[PDB]
Every structure is written in C-alpha cells, then in structure tokens.
Design a protein around this nucleic acid. Structure first.
Lengths: 77, 76, 76, 77
DNA sequence: ATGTGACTTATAGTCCGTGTGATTATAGTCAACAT
DNA sequence: ATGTTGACTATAATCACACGGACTATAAGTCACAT
C-alpha cells in the first residue's frame, strides 16, 4: 500500500498509548467513530488532512508535535 | 476551512515555485489532474495522505523535507 | 439490595409455602443446594435466569404463572 | 440452551427497537458494557436479576410492563 | 499558462452490529456447624 | 427442619479491540470554458 500512511497510522497509535488513551477515548475526543480509529490503526486507512487534524486535537497534541514524531518514525531503523 | 489544510497547500505551492514548476508540470510529474492541483493551491481541496504523497513525488521532495517545511511554515 | 430481587425471592418463598413445601424439598426437587435456596429466600442471592428457571421447575410452576404472581406481588 | 433466556433476550431486543434505541445507547443507559447488550441479544446470555433490572431501567420501561411482554412472548405460536 | 463550474465515480467516513481473547467481580455449588 | 460462615470454581460481567456490511458525505478524477 502506502509508505506515509502506515507511518501516520503507527504514530497515531503510538501517541495514543503514550497518553494512556484507549481507542474509545480517542474516537471520543476526535468526534470520529471508534470503528474509524480502529480502522486507521489496523489497516492504515487513507485519511483526509481534516480527519488527521481532528485526531491530533483528540490526542491532545499539536500539528507541530505530531509532525515531529512523524518525521522521527519515518527516519527509523 | 482548516488551518493545516491551508498551510499544506501553501507549502505545496511554495515548493512548486522554489523549484520553478508550473501547475501543469506538477500535475504531469505526479500523474494527477491539473485542475485538481489548482484546486489544492487555492485550497479548495482536502487531500488524503495518499494524494499528498503523490504530490510530494511530483515535487520530488521526500516526506521528511515536506514536513520539515510544513512545520516551519506553520509557526508563522 | 434490589427491589425486584426481593420480590422474586418473596415470590419463590410464597409459592413454596402455598404448596406446603420445605426448602429441603424445594432443593431436592430442583437439584440445587439447600443452603443455596435458603440464601435466596433470605434475599442474599442475586440469581440468574437459569437458576430462577430451575427453581420454577422445582416449584412445579410454569414461567407464566410465576411472572403473573411476581407482577402482582410487585404492585404492593 | 435455556427456554426462558431466549425469551428474555428476545424481549429486550423487541423493546429496544420499539423505542428506536440502538444497542450502544442501551448499553450506556443500562450502565453495562457495550458488548454485553450485544451478547445478550446475539446469542442469549444468562443474566442476573440485577442486570436485568438495569436493562429495564435502560429500556426506560417498568419491571411490570417488561414482565407483561415477557409473558406474551412465552405464549406464542 | 491558471481558474472556474459543474458533473460522475470512487472512496472516505458514518452508523449499527457481530465475535473474541483476557481480566475482574461475583454467582454457583458445596463444605462445617448452628439453631 | 432452616440459618450462617467461609470456602472453592464456574461463570457473569468488564474492558480494549477487531471485523463486516450498508449507507451517506465527499474526495478523486475528468469534461467544458473561461482568463
């Protein structure tokens, strides 16, 4: 599938667990379905920037902070 | 509209220019539609990550450079 | 404790008595433990439907007759 | 498995739909797990009088009218 | 060249439900001794 | 006869998650016509 997606997928989960959230909490605060949060983490779904933005707000994290961890995950071995 | 969306778009336009590309050529290079691109640059589109990825390929810019730039752009 | 659970227990005891049964006999007839039965009637047990069902069979009473009674008891 | 159980589980669903509720509303209002409401209807499951009571409160229905519909369902052919 | 508009078609995102391993609270069942 | 106190062990009930189908909103991709 897509390189960037699974990275975006990975980072959303990583943060979520770092903050001791559950998918239920997250989909809560992101005002998306818990099915969608699952869908994203599970099968790296192809979300929209707007949806990503909602998730960032849900993770109680900033644009910047997210993208900084995104860059880190991309760079890894 | 969205704050992020506008700066993604701004960034896309910034890079296209710093490189000296036309929209026509960014569309060709990324195998997407020119009106599609025009839309994004006037910020009338809400890309998916996949699309963004194709535009990065077209701009010939790695994900990292794009995001390094987007961050800087984000901080006024 | 619970209102319903109390009325259920009361009903179980009521029917046992109008039939002149002992607890010992109610437990023999439904193959459950006598201390188990005791416990319900002193309202110290929160039984499951399955258990309730075994007790009805031990009381020789249909589900319907039981609930008809349970409703009436519920209404003071 | 159990005669009465599938009757109880049938009636919980009947009411739930009659009141235009979804499972996960009822799971909230009944102050029980999401998956328990499913599990009760889905298969049958052997609930407790206390849990049944919670569900009745959740269906926004009285002990009495629940049991009245229970009786009616038992009596069917 | 770029910017519209408007018009399909793919798919992102929603909504309601099923099914499941793992853990925790508690009912199910049965001792010993009471009265 | 019934009551009560511990117990052990089955299972009710919880919690975090995956997975599917069907439906709705909207992004993806392509026309025509501006400039």
């Amino acid at each position: 599938e897509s390189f960037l997606l699974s990275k975006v997928s990975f980072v959303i989960k990583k943060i979520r667990l770092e903050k001791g959230m559950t998918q239920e909490d997250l989909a809560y605060k992101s005002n998306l379905d818990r099915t969608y949060i699952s869908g994203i983490e599970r099968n790296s779904r192809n979300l929209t920037i707007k949806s990503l933005e909602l998730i960032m707000k849900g993770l109680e994290v900033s644009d910047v902070v997210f993208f900084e961890m995104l860059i880190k995950e991309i760079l890894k071995h």
